[PDB]
Amino acid sequence: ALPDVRDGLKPVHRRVLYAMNVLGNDWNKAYKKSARVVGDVIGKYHPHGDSAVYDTIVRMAQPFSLRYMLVDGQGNFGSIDGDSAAAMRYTEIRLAKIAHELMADLEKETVDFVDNYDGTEKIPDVMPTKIPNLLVNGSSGIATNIPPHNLTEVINGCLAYIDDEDISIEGLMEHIPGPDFPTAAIINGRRGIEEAYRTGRGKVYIRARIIVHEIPYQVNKARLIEKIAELVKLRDESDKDGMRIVIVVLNNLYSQTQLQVSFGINMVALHHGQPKIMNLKDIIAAFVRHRREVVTRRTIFELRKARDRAHILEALAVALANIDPIIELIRHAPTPAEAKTALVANPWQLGNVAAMLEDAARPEWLEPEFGVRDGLYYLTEQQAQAILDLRLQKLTGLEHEKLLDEYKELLDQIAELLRILGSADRLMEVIREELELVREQFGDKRRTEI
């Protein structure tokens, strides 16, 4: 019921986006019918059959609901007049490009996973988000009430915090002057913004921009129009190219109608598994600390993966340099178990890959009796099984070359990853550069006037 402070998501949102990721329902592939994603979420992650899962998909696609849409939707996803989306069998969805940034590096052991409801699947506890989504898209529930914000502004605030962790709320507000609604309009109550940013709680007012061009966030246009007719105890000329409501009285309309509304900001989020009231700085610090954890864990993962792969490739290169005796050995083995034991029994000469093979690339788990030792290769059982799994086409010149090239590139990736892990400065710089690139790729203009 409360969003996680780190990714801004509640469980239902996270389960939806996760299912889309697992489906490969990517920004650069064909749309899928909404029903497919709904069915996957219901069966694997959120085993309830009411309207919440599809409702969440629909909200995440509506440009009048989310400041940065997380779902790219095609078809009828409803309108600001409150009409419903078409049924899930008709609408088409895929991940928005920015949703890939929310889930960047999820496959790289960057976040803890928890059991799904039947213990057959894992689900991330939180997304390894590059986007400060809690602030930029906001959240509500009945309690928390966090308005959306401009991504450029929020990223600038994160970077200012990284530069000076003692930055004041006033300092942060030089970069983040207030909320930014997808529906634009006007905010009127600067003290309310400051009190929210300082304490977590502050009430602000949102005013429409007689011709009405923009209305407050979360106001239903058709209901607004009916409300005006009822108080009159007007035409809607809006279209695809923008909103246009046609109607002294204006101040009166602002006084008794949703042409002005209050927004009670109440920044409550899950923080270390507990609900907590959080100010602007708490929220930014939590996001930054999350980036530190993610990037560290990612770098460790990549280093491990690269060493593991390089280790398998060493075996393959040695076998392919010793192809005749390898074949002679396997052909005379009664069974695959005996071939594997014969492979590991006696070390192998390195041949023309000697220079290429001769500590940085050794997996940390590899005991000292294995690997290159005195110009000879001592294979593990796993390495022997990889030789036994080699297809005959890997003996052709090009496939042999590709393996050697892959090994060489891994050696360079490993040296680089060690330099990064070994340097707090490098690691912090990766974090910053990632934020800055997010700003360059996805940052847009402010819409709401403060």
Added chain:
Amino acid sequence: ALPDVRDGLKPVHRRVLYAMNVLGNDWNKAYKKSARVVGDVIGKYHPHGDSAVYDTIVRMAQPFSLRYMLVDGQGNFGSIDGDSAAAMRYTEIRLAKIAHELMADLEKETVDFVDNYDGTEKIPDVMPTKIPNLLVNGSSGIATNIPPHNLTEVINGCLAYIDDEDISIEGLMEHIPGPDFPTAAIINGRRGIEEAYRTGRGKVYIRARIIVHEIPYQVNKARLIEKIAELVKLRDESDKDGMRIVIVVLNNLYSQTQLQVSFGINMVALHHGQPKIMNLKDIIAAFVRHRREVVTRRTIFELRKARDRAHILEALAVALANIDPIIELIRHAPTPAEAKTALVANPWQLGNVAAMLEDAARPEWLEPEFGVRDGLYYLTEQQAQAILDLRLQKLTGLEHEKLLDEYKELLDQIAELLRILGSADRLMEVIREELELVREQFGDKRRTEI
């Protein structure tokens, strides 16, 4: 909305059972949560989110609903008193053993498949059922109304029809004297049974077996009890070990209460894509004709599959008999494309598999320039790619032996399949023997007294 005469299923039932088959949710594996199957059905086959999919799962598991349950359910699936099943996240299901007979040989091109709703999946149009499910489990909908029947009886009727296609309705009724309800009780109206079997339509009456031990099919026990209290302008002592309702008056109760109900038999099913009223003989003939189509198509499929596999294995055996020159060829090939062209360029000597290799096993699509020709093997490109895909462990003695043994068994399977396809007598005998085995494995005692 109407069941297919051949499998007795409506689309929703077929989509449920199909999803369970695709999931591998088999009788001899662990139960899965109902929600998983629901989610898969909704996402892939039946993209509507109301109660129908789960309701269908629940009905198929209830021993008071289906004469032969198609779902094996564990947990609370509701009762004859009309209480609801527990929610889908709590109940556990797998296919009943007999449901595997309903879908036997589905993977062997035995039935036509149709597009699912988004054109990303195939769904069978009908199941290749060994079970005459329309009769044994019945159907209803608002119209068709077909009561359930005893499997032993119905199979005996099918076999009697196969022996004499001119069998009369009276002849069939020597094997099938009437319906058989899962809830037992008593049928009172033999003319109604005969008129239904002769014409498709007949009305019959079902009577409870004061102590009530059995009640009519589709009667809710709790509602029956309330109905008796209302007319009285009694205790339920039923338990896990059987039904027991405790209450001259009896005849009166039979006259004004569901201790007796009418069942209007109306045997309407889909037949060649059209709704048709069908008599007993029409229904049996349709099932038998379906078995003829299935077994023919299955036999053709197996023959094709076996020839295809044998053809790939011939290439592998020849390569493994020529392992040195094969390796020399591939090692000196600049790329896998050049290795493949070199493999196919020149025919191969047969070596010690000559006797084993030397028309019955040739795929029907294989042009005469390929295969064994004058003691030499001419490879296709596909066969060359299979050699290139061979893992080094296939050179060990045991893996080499397993390949040769597989080829030998395929040769014998192919000779047998040709004998069957070539003989209407053999083919009809397979059909009969399959029915008889169904009767032996799944046949049980009559429950309802006529």
